[PDB]
Design a binder for this molecule. Structure first.
Ligand SMILES: Cn1ccc(-c2ccc(Cl)c(CNc3nc4[nH]c(Cc5ccccc5)cc(=O)n4n3)c2)n1
Ligand SMILES: [Zn+2]
Length: 349
């Protein structure tokens, strides 16, 4: 309760502390977009959220470029619910992405190659800052700025049509944020990013990287949640502590492999499931931070032990299935978390 608050305070002070890092990243990114926009395949390219995956690493940034693709035809791959072939409707007004077609199918490989190549050409043009490009270890392109700051650049396709049918029963926020809000969010665009399941096929994965911010900024059942003193909730703090718990555990055991397949979006997913289960703001009273954090831990442990964690958008996709993460890894993380809970969370210090 008091220990958790102190953890949150030290995290806050490093975030809010004076840093030239964001200015250096923006300068590099703005150069790239100008270079990409001159190219025929990428003239519509722009920034998605005009981010930090690790709270413990303030020099590591995550950036997403988006490209609008109108009249897109999506074909689900092998019933995976999340992976799709990208085809183009027969509306030929010269498609800018034709050079990436392999048949009727849009090739992620060929598109990333030319994105990669154009970026590489603008890197070796900038003289002010030293920018170093790493070699395709997806997640698309990783840059190194002044040997301290690192940026992962992801290329996403953007569609403004209705979300695919696999999402129909997801985003189960009706009893928490309202049916009206669920409708508003589902009018936003959706995104597609490269990579396949399990030979390599040219499939894209659905991406909803823009939804979390929308929820977190308007997260209460009450419209006035966290706008006054009588309605302060701990939802954002609990999510931060879950993300930091996993980070610290991945760092403690980084020389082993048992935690390599877990990442923040697993924690995000399980957190927002607890928000669905506990929709009222009184279930998230600031005074109950330690107890609320415990709900979240307990639910995440239940997910590990049962090997069931539904994607928040595509509920039939089990993030914790045997084919994606094996029993041994889930059993290892369970033991570490259970040890943390029973020892007043050592990792935080
Ligand atoms: C990064 N990765 C690697 C593989 C996948 C992935 C796997 C299966 C599916 Cl079925 C999908 C479907 N798409 C998808 N699912 C999420 N879940 C959240 C987390 C979240 C939860 C609740 C509210 C807000 C955010 C973030 C995000 O961007 N997405 N995108 C994505 N993702
Ligand atoms: Zn609140």
């Amino acid at each position: 309760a008091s220990k958790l608050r102190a953890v949150l305070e030290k995290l806050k002070l490093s975030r809010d502390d004076i840093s030239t890092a964001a200015g250096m990243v923006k300068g590099v990114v703005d150069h790239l977009l100008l270079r990409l926009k001159c190219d025929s395949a990428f003239r519509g390219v722009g920034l998605l959220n005009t981010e930090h995956v690790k709270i413990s690493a303030p020099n590591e940034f995550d950036v997403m470029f988006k490209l609008e693709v109108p009249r897109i035809q999506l074909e689900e791959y092998s019933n995976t619910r999340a992976y799709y072939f990208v085809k183009f409707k027969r509306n030929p007004k010269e498609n800018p992405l034709s050079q990436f077609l392999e048949g009727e199918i849009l090739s992620a490989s060929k598109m990333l190659s030319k994105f990669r190549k154009i970026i590489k050409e603008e890197i070796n043009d900038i003289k002010d800052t030293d920018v170093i490009m790493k070699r395709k270890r997806s997640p698309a392109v990783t840059l190194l700025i002044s040997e301290k700051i690192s940026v992962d650049i992801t290329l996403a396709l953007e569609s403004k049509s209705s979300w695919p049918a696999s999402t129909q029963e997801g985003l189960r926020i009706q009893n928490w944020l309202s049916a009206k809000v669920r409708k508003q969010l589902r009018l936003k665009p959706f995104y597609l990013v490269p990579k396949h399941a399990k030979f390599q096929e040219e499939t894209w994965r659905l991406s909803f990287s823009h939804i979390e911010k929308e929820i977190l900024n308007n997260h209460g059942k009450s419209k006035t949640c966290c706008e006054n003193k009588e309605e302060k909730c701990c939802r954002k703090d609990c999510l931060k502590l879950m993300k930091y718990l996993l980070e610290q555990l991945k760092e403690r055991f980084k020389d082993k492999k048992h935690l390599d397949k877990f990442s923040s979006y697993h924690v995000k997913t399980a957190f927002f499931h607890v928000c669905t289960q506990n929709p009222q703001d009184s279930q998230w009273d600031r005074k109950d931070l330690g107890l609320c954090f415990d709900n979240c831990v307990t639910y995440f442990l239940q997910c590990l032990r049962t090997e069931k964690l539904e994607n928040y958008f595509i509920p039939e996709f089990n993030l914790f299935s045997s084919n994606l993460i094996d029993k041994r890894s889930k059993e290892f993380l369970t033991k570490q978390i259970e040890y943390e809970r029973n020892n007043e969370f050592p990792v935080f210090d």
